[PDB]
């Protein structure tokens, strides 16, 4: 039957489809970076990332209010990773930050590319986790 928890899983298939599109665009941006460019991939990345947090930050306050404690708990490892990159390591920046003024010197370029496949692997597993517990809460 349709319930509020089943709607909280329907509403996060729709927005995790945006979260994977943020990351397909994020692996192309660093691949096209190595081919060519700094100031544009400063600006094009910097606009993208703050939607990616708060959409996932929406999911934290949505499954908290839905009483889905396993689902809220599985968004916790991505959440506390996200608090670190904005409260303590968004290195100095001050336009938005983080995929900003600090490009080559090439040590963050390897750290971003390991992150960029780690985001896609979590989001593609979150998409089928959300699609399963949608079908779970609807049928049951």
């Amino acid at each position: 039957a349709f319930t509020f928890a089943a709607f909280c899983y329907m509403l996060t298939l729709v927005l995790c489809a945006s979260l994977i599109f943020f990351v397909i665009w994020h692996i192309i941006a660093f691949d096209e970076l190595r081919t060519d460019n700094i100031e544009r991939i400063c600006c094009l990345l910097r606009k993208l990332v703050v939607p990616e947090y708060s959409i996932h930050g929406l999911f934290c306050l949505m499954f908290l209010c839905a009483a889905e404690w396993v689902t809220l708990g599985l968004n916790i490892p991505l959440l506390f990773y996200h608090l670190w990159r904005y409260f303590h390591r968004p290195a100095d920046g001050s336009e938005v930050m983080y995929d900003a003024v600090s490009i080559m010197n090439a040590d963050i370029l390897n750290y971003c590319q390991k992150e960029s496949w780690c985001k896609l692997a979590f989001y593609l597993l979150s998409f089928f986790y959300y699609l399963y517990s949608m079908v779970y809460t609807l049928v049951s």
Partner: protein
């Protein structure tokens, strides 16, 4: 002297004999005597007891004591067929079946809370409405920022969706195809939700429908809001003490400990404590008095649920009387001819004082919590200006 069994008739001063009295057991004594063929003398008991064997002197009192010791020949009265009485007198078959029942106060209009205005829609709907509001506002923001035609950042998307839901129109509207699919489906959502709020509110205000919180003694055992209590002594007191079933042991550990004392001392004290506790006292008493007080004035009390046990009222004779067999067959004649049902409908229902519109304006109480949110939102808006004036 017990109602409706024997009541002294209104002008009993100018009357004499078997016609000073009226009631169920006066109309029953008439029926027993014309089927058994005798002439009778209605005689109210002395002590005022029903009958009990004294623990020290071993002497029966009440109506049982008059039949054992010779002062009476029959006791046509609400006298409960029990084990200790059957050993000394002889009962007939039960002319009335009854048991322990629940008396609550009759439910009322049930004054509103703060968030009573939310009640036409379930709380599971309102939670889905709030999270669909942020849902369509993020999707407006995703659609308008990436693949632009904007003027639709995250706070102009939250204001488009708030104004669309409140049916206040807009100042800006989306210009692209994909922003108009977001905007137009959220418009259709709002149209169904606001129309079903007004339609379900019109149903509530048209049809009053008062439900009782207690409809069983299981429902009393699963709560501590409503305090339930028997009389201080008697058979309803003794029932919950020695019970072993599942539920009446739960109801007994409640009543024996609870402060203030739920045990009233008189039936009229228990009825008044029902009427004067606005739905917080449920009185446990026999089902025959419960159906009678429900029919007296005021209409303030109600019987709920089934009975808790099964007992009966018998017509008693001394052990060895020659009335014992014909009165027993007289009761079974009166049962199957519908006489006993007819006498109960006369004295409980046809002589019942309680028997068995005009929509009123909405009071401020019904909608008062919308005023609290408004001034609570006016004061919250004056703080956000104060933070905006400091931060800039």
């Amino acid at each position: 002297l017990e109602s409706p069994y024997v009541m002294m008739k209104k002008n009993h001063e100018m009357l004499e004999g078997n016609e000073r009295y009226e009631g169920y057991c006066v109309d029953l004594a008439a029926e027993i005597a014309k089927h058994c063929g005798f002439k009778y003398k209605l005689t109210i008991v002395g002590d005022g007891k029903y009958g009990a064997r004294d623990a020290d002197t071993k002497i029966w009192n009440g109506m049982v004591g008059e039949l054992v010791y010779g002062k009476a020949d029959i006791a046509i009265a609400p006298l409960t067929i029990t084990l200790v009485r059957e050993e000394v007198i002889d009962f007939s078959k039960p002319f009335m079946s009854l048991g322990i029942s629940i008396m609550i106060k009759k439910p009322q209009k049930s004054k509103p809370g703060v968030f009573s205005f939310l009640d036409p829609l379930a709380y599971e709907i309102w939670m889905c409405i709030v999270f669909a509001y942020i849902g369509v506002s993020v999707v407006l923001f995703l659609v308008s920022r990436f693949s632009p035609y904007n003027e639709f950042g995250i706070f102009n998307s939250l204001w488009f969706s708030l104004g669309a839901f409140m049916q206040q129109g807009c100042d800006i509207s989306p210009r692209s195809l994909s922003g108009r699919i977001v905007g137009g489906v959220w418009w259709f959502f709002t149209l169904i939700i606001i129309s079903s709020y007004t339609a379900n509110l019109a149903a509530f205000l048209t049809v009053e429908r008062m439900v009782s919180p207690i409809e069983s003694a299981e429902d009393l055992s699963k709560q501590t809001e409503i305090a339930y209590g028997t009389l201080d002594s008697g058979s309803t007191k003794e029932f919950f003490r020695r019970s072993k079933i599942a539920v009446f042991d739960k109801m007994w550990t409640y009543m024996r400990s609870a402060e203030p004392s739920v045990f009233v001392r008189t039936t009229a004290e228990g009825v008044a404590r029902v009427r004067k506790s606005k739905g917080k006292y449920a009185y446990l008493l026999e089902s025959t008095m419960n159906e009678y007080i429900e029919q007296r004035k005021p209409c303030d009390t109600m019987k709920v649920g089934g009975n808790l046990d099964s007992k009966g009222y018998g017509i008693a004779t001394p052990k060895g009387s020659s009335l014992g067999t014909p009165v027993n067959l007289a009761v079974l004649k009166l049962s199957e001819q519908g006489v006993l049902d007819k006498l109960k409908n006369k004295w409980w229902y046809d002589k019942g004082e309680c028997g068995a519109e005009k929509t009123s304006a909405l009071s401020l109480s019904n909608v008062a919590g919308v005023f609290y949110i408004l001034v609570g939102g006016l004061g919250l808006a004056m703080l956000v200006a104060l933070i905006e004036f400091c931060y800039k």
